[PDB]
């Protein structure tokens, strides 16, 4: 995605579901650059599931942070993979 493309995803998925006044779309565009469109849509889905599971009726900025941290990482193994070291 382009930066302008990124903006749309945030806007479109946030209409379908609850949002917090705390949570700003403006905020999200700045924070998320250099990612595939597939990853951003994932995070947005994740945050909405998490918020409801946390037994609320709103998506807070807090769930969105937590969902972001979750989706970007899944690997925590270091000091290996020689072909670039």
């Amino acid at each position: 995605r382009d930066r302008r493309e990124r903006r749309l995803i945030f806007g479109t998925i946030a209409s379908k579901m609850s949002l917090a006044p705390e949570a700003d779309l403006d905020s999200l565009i700045i924070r998320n650059d250099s990612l595939s469109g597939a990853v951003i849509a994932a995070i947005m889905q994740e945050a909405g599931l998490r918020a409801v599971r946390k037994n609320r009726y709103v998506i807070l900025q807090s769930d969105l942070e937590e969902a972001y941290a979750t989706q970007v990482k899944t690997d925590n193994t270091v000091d290996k993979f020689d072909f670039y070291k």
Binding site: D2, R4, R7, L8, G11, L25, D26, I29
Partner: protein, 326 residues
């Protein structure tokens, strides 16, 4: 005095200590003096090195000149001084010529005087073999006509240039003329043509590297056609991307330029009927840059007036903010 360097420093500082008017007597003095070798290159001194420093000095001088109103002697002087540089380097002549013309229009100016520098220059070049980027300058020459409200004339000039770029001359020159041609069409309210030409402009842009500001101008037009043919959501997104680019350029993007794009950015959101997001764009100073104007005041008053659904409230804002706003 009696050294090029010392007299460079002096002439420049003469502006700062008091005024330009003192400085100009010094600048004028730089021409008579210094140099006992090489080719004619000030029409009062023969030189190489003095004239070379004179280029950067003339370049300062000319900015201040537009303020002074003394521009008129310089508008003639630059075309006389082209040949000084042909007897140096051809590349230098081409180069210098483009930068001096760029400085004068970065300051507000009357057209009549601008037309006049360029005109001599392009005719004179032709005689030798220098045709390289006198065509780029003809694209600039369109631009003064565009503001003048000679679109019809710009159109005739632009059409020939398109042909030249497309298999007789340079690939990057093409993008810029397709951009202008889009602004030109748009003013005639030829929405159809303006749009089709941007689509061509973008295909031509991604072939190459196009300067950062140019890319943002592309995004500005795209957003503009989507306010006039709807799809304000898509427009907004482009105005986001364009505004961020203008921010990052700093003061190499004019103050005024950045404000008119913000004015459009607020306006698209109100039509789109997310008014509370108009309040978020204001309340942030990364997304407004603390650009507050009567224009910007108007958009918060209009969002408020919509929420209220009070017709009276719109009429009050419109008239008060008017001069800045429309």
């Amino acid at each position: 005095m009696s050294l090029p360097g010392s007299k460079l420093e002096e002439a420049r500082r003469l502006v700062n200590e008091k005024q330009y008017n003192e400085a100009e007597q010094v600048y004028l003095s730089l021409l008579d003096k210094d140099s006992s070798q090489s080719s004619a290159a000030a029409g009062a001194s023969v030189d190489d090195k003095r004239r070379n420093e004179q280029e950067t000095s003339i370049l300062e001088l000319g900015q201040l000149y537009v303020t002074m109103g003394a521009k008129d002697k310089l508008r003639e002087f630059i075309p006389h001084s082209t040949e000084y540089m042909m007897q140096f380097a051809k590349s230098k002549t081409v180069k210098v010529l483009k930068t001096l013309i760029e400085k004068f229009e970065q300051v507000p100016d009357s057209l009549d005087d601008q037309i006049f520098v360029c005109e001599k220059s392009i005719e004179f070049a032709k005689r030798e073999k220098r045709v390289f980027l006198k065509h780029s300058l003809s694209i600039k020459l369109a631009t003064l006509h565009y503001q003048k409200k000679q679109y019809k004339d710009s159109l005739a000039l632009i059409n020939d240039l398109l042909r030249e770029f497309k298999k007789l001359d340079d690939k990057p020159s093409l993008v810029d003329v397709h951009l202008l041609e889009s602004k030109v069409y748009h003013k005639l309210r030829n929405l159809a043509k303006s749009k089709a030409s941007l689509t061509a402009a973008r295909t031509a842009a991604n072939s190459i590297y196009c300067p950062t500001q140019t890319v943002a101008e592309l995004d500005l037009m795209s957003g503009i056609l989507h306010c006039e043919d709807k799809d304000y959501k898509t427009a907004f997104s482009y105005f986001f991307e364009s505004f961020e680019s203008y921010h990052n350029l700093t003061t190499h993007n004019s103050y005024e330029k950045a404000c008119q794009v913000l004015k459009y950015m607020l306006l698209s959101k109100i039509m789109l009927n997310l008014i509370d997001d108009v309040k978020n764009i204001l309340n942030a100073k990364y997304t407004k840059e603390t650009y507050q104007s009567r224009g910007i005041d108007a958009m918060k008053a209009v969002a408020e007036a919509y929420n209220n659904r009070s017709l009276l409230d719109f009429n009050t804002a419109l008239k008060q903010y008017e001069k800045e706003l429309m």
